[PDB]
Subunit: 294 residues, 6 copies
Amino acid sequence: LKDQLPEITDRIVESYRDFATTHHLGHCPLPSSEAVYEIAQDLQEILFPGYRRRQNLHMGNVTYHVGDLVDSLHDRLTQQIARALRHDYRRQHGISCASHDFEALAQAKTITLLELLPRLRRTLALDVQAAFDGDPAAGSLDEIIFCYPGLHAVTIYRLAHELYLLDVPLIPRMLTEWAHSQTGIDIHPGATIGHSFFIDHGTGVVIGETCEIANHVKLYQGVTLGALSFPRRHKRHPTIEDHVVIYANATVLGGETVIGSHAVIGSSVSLSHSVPPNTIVTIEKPSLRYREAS
Amino acid sequence: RLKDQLPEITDRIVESYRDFATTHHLGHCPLPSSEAVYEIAQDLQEILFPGYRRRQNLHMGNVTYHVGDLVDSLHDRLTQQIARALRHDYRRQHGISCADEVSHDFEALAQAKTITLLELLPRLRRTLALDVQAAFDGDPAAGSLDEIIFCYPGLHAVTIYRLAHELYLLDVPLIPRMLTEWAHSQTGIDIHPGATIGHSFFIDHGTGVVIGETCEIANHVKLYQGVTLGALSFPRHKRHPTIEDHVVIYANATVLGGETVIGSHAVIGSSVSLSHSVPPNTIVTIEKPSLRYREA
Amino acid sequence: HSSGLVPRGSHMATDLRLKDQLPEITDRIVESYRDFATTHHLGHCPLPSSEAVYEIAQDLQEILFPGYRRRQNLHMGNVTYHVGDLVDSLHDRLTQQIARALRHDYRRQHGISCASHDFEALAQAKTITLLELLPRLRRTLALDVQAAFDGDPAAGSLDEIIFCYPGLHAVTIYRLAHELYLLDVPLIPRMLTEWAHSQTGIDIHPGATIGHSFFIDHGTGVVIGETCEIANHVKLYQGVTLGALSFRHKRHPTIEDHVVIYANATVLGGETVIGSHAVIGSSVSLSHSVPPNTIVTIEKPSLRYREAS
Amino acid sequence: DLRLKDQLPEITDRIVESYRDFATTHHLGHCPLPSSEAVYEIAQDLQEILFPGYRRRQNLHMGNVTYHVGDLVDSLHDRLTQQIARALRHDYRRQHGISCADEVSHDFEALAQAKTITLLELLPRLRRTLALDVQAAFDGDPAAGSLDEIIFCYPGLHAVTIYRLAHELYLLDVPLIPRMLTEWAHSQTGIDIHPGATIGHSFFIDHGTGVVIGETCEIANHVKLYQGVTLGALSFPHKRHPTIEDHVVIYANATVLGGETVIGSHAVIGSSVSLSHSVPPNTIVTIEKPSLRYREAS
Amino acid sequence: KDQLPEITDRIVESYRDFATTHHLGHCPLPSSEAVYEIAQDLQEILFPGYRRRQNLHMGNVTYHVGDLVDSLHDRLTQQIARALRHDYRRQHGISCADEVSHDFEALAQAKTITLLELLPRLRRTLALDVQAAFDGDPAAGSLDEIIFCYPGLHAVTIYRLAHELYLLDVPLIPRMLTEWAHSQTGIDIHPGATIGHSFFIDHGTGVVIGETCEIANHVKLYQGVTLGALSFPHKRHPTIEDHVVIYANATVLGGETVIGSHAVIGSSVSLSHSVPPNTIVTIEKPSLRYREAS
Amino acid sequence: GLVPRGSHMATDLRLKDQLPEITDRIVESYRDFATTHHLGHCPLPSSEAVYEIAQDLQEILFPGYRRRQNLHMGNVTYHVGDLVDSLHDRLTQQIARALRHDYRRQHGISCAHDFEALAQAKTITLLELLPRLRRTLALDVQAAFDGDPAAGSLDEIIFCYPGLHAVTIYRLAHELYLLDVPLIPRMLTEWAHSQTGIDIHPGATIGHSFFIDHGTGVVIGETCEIANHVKLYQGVTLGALSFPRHKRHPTIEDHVVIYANATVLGGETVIGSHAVIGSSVSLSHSVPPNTIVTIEKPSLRYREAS
Ligand SMILES: [Cl-]
Ligand SMILES: [Cl-]
Ligand SMILES: [Cl-]
């Protein structure tokens, strides 16, 4: 009977006492996943108006739309950042929970992010053009903006990256993993990535925290820019110089691996050492076995 | 008091819209809506697989009402979306800007394409019935047709692809790629709407599969996760492979090139990377890998 | 018969008279339901609901990780209300969903048409079993969270892991699905794991057996088969397949304690055992056993280098 | 502060305890009563069927209306069945002092479905009646713009539509639901019609706020009422409310009381008239010209 | 369930038989819900900070207003056009025909712009109504309480919007608005009524004001007041002059009935003839009978 | 009805260029008429938050009759506990805004746990008296059953009798009034007034076993005092003298019935225990206990229709 339910409830609540690591019970709200996703939506509406939720934006009403989003983002970002800072401070110092202070610091950070939205749009315009240049078959800039997952993942990454530079805990990774969830493109928020970046297809792409990518680089599906199996904090991920292309399913590992300007890394190539500028690296023609099914 | 700087930030953002006009669409001419397109896709799937989607109370005595309503609504919504796609593509091809009255241009043409799509739904069900059976045939361990329809991501991605493909054949801009990229997002399966794919197609697992615009796949084919049917790095014009009937391609294989033909009943083994044709009834496998073993 | 632009009829609006054809389209669609009955479930026998299963999953996660999901205002003084309400609701919803799954499977197993046992009572028993083991699942998942922290040195905190590491999410859903699998619930286990698959690109069959302190880092492209058995303290990376040979019955590998399998490795076969503390390097493809304490890596690849022109 | 939040568990317990002490204003147990929201929803769907094009959907035409109606009928069948069954079961248990542990062995679902089918079957007839009501509003209001304006927003028509639905449920012995319907309409219009009232066709309430019509009241055809009219029972007293014959008009703030009061065919009851006795056909009843006092202001 | 298709068919049949109570065709009438939403938006413009949003300040209110004005332009145009088209067709016995029609659209837009243009003037009039409520209710807590919840103010606000639409010859919509307010307050004001500034209804339940009624400035009414037409009859409703107070349950009837400047109509007074300026009209004390109970 | 020329052209999109200017004139009007806005950084209480609070309180008072139908003794603690927790937060916030705004207004102060703590204390007081309120409301329910012999059941009364809804809201509002909460009490009674046409000032004092039958058009003034076992009908006014805080509305003693459309006026008017005020009676002075007041039989005119 339902008479068992109160007891099951009580055992679960008891388990909150026993295993305290997987709950946050108390008077100190962490940041909200949903609030961070909503922030992300609003930021994207500012960056690509006409391509998101509203389709009735024109020069005569866009100020009202942006103005309202900026006002709301100021409040929401401040709140979420403040909770991230408070929680991280408490955790670092082992302090328990029992417009000033962290709030003011959060607001300062929030305003910095909002102030760089014009600059971000400049950067993102070059990424859009990189997608157009990088995919000859592409219909239009509009198609790219609507639905190229590489552009979406990069957009989120660039927002998360700015917050990373501002020492915001939690929220950068929450943003990148949201994009990762939608696109299968996994970019650490600490990665440094220059303008005119394009990921085509993208599923399975992984880019590590200390990875440094210059301008005009293109990656394909399944590319890993990662750390070596064996032994921007301590550099453990590769540097990719300008105008590099890395084809599908390549792997590039190591904090000292530099892929030089204008290099091409062929499909399925696995590298743990530097490549000179102007080099095409490809796999040896595979040795395949053939048999008839009989 | 610091909220007083927000109006200035707002003005700088609006200014950036003048300076970088390539990444916005401001004006009196709505583009197609991602959300409306998604909703259309939901309604189409309701028609294709009733009893497996949102409603669970459908039977032969009420199904006409469900379908009839969806068909009527889809007529209106697809017409609207497709017309906006056609108008946008017209304006872009001609470099013309947005008019000062509301424009019904292309509405009749959009309606004609919409009706063609709705007319094909019975045929699409026939094809999808074979795909469903192909999943059951292709995965011994499958619990039932029901399980497949409910949650096999391959079937979902292919369903969206087949819808998008019909729109592609009708020269609808934007909407086909919007559909396949939606499916791509949900399944990790990346099928270009331009691909040609015969009946009884099955993708098992599916994450990381990529199939290019020009790829041609015949009947009774099965692929696994991480398969690429793609273009050569270097050496409507055909740049993607042709796969003949009854071929199976195992996990993480790569088949590249517009002149690569994989012959009837061939098997492409796991991790095989090919840029040349394979005759019928050939099993192609990698050379046993050379591995290094050491004590830790 | 001339025009001011390329396609003829560009000026014409929607012809509303053409709406008269829609009833016929509708009738042909309904006819196709008669002709191809395999891809619909029309009748008086609701199958389980995808949406209901998703909602159940949300509520289970709220119980497992309170404070990290939808509510942020939970404390020891109000958590009883939160849990008690969810347990009550889950009891009803899981019973309903499981009962429909059992009924449908029974009918399908036999010939029985929709026009036999007490499936509701059996469903409720299975539901109660699941709810009873939530404290135990919390214990397991606490170790998984710690394994993510240990397995990723660059990890910010337990908090960041719980909030957004996709491996933890996929493993949480899998562990719930697995218990339902062990209770012989049809449909629902795979519905759960495919949901997580869709969200993370991590594909765990609900039949897989996986010990505590399991960690998937990155994870996109991971596939684990039905009969795979993974021990304690195992760590996997993106693109790893633990699958079946191309060329009930065990068809998937066994991975022993403390094994690490790096990105894009493939391990195949029912008889393949990867031994305690082994390391399978990136892109390693194996269909045979490896002893304890063995590090397996690919041979340095043979690469061609030439000038880009 | 947050320390005071520690009192909330205790306040919660005081409330739960009070459910044990005062059981009459709660219904806790495993026997859901009917849902106000579900009844309101049913009413919305019924109105969609009766007045398509004037309610929620604006894209209905002869080519799609079968799908709309077919779907609503199907939904209503399930929801009305559920709501009626819950009402019947509760009323059974209450009348017999049974209680919710003790299983009901009676098939209220089948009976609820039968009552539901009866209501659905008479919707065509109800449309016939309501068509006459709409015309009566047009004929009864000189200033009326169109039938469309009337259908859209005349509160008299809305209250009467709900009443007519509630009345058929009343005649089918459905507990709770008929009064839930009429009270919803009362809430929206100020027009308070008991579901038991008997009202003929071509009925019109103009303005309507403050209208009260009692359970046993009987109104013929072509009757018109204004705001504030009471057709009620005697204060100092089975039929306890008046009978109004055809073609009667009753002006604002009139009061007509008593089970034996018959207002005769084509009578006119003037503004503010208060009556507790019958009136013959073709009689105009008015108040005596009031004696008013006039004084200069300061 | 086997009975249901037949019931469905008989209902559809009855649509053919009784065609006056449906609007089936290709010609959307106006939408009640769209009209209500338009009314919500207009109310937000008229009384910002007292409606749905509570975070409005001088720095963001332009964005809020600007956005609503932009949207209201589109939605009012659409609703008014549908009203004009339907009413014209109906008046002239024209049927729907099977073409999507821009008919009356430009005229609807014109009327819509005129309405939006007079919103500043409406605010000026309503500021006088709010003061009248404060003046007319000496027990009133604050202007805020009045604005928040005095039902007289809400009914008058709706009526004033409806009345401007009535003056613009917009069919259907004005009555839709006043009946909506009627439904929420028990106050029934025909949109055709003429009402001057500083108007106040206190309590209000049961107030009826007729189409041809004319009310001057500084007038106050109470619950249950009827300003109506004669039972035994183009002006059919009374004229109320400046500074008149009409107390609870009074009834004032007739097109030729003029209540003179500064008159007072006492509770329960029933009048069908003019009253001179500066006159206080009261009922004769009732003849009451008293008896001891038992 | 001349249709002006140009009427049938499509919307002219360049006319939207005028909308910014219209917007500016509207904003200007906020500067010119500042009494009818509340622009700034100090939000007032929200109508919708107050309504939601009211819904939650009603769920606590009448569980099984409102939004949830699956409540039983095994789960009701969870339901109530959660509502109380949420109410504590929301009532605290709303009350604090009421108190802050009222203080600023009463003094000159402009906008650039003090009130919060005071708000919380009042919120706790309200929540603590909910069991007592349920006792009182149970008596009101029973008074409706006793006072309307045709009533089907307590259930029906709870489900849909408007008098009981109006009175429920009034009793909640009245407790907030007694705690000197500005704004919110009148917001609550006006909401009830809107749904029922029953208009009760939050300051009214009303004893147990109170029933209003039908109710539309009832008005009860701020200083009115109503004892126990009182019944009112539709259209009853308990109001102030037109030509006369400090008592200006009547006192109604126990067991009084007032029938439809009666008017009782004046702060010194006391209607004695067990009196009956007949339909349409108008009274502006006291009547002793056990007095039955009726109007003289009306003098009516009858004529033949012509
Ligand atoms: Cl592709
Ligand atoms: Cl009516
Ligand atoms: Cl009106």
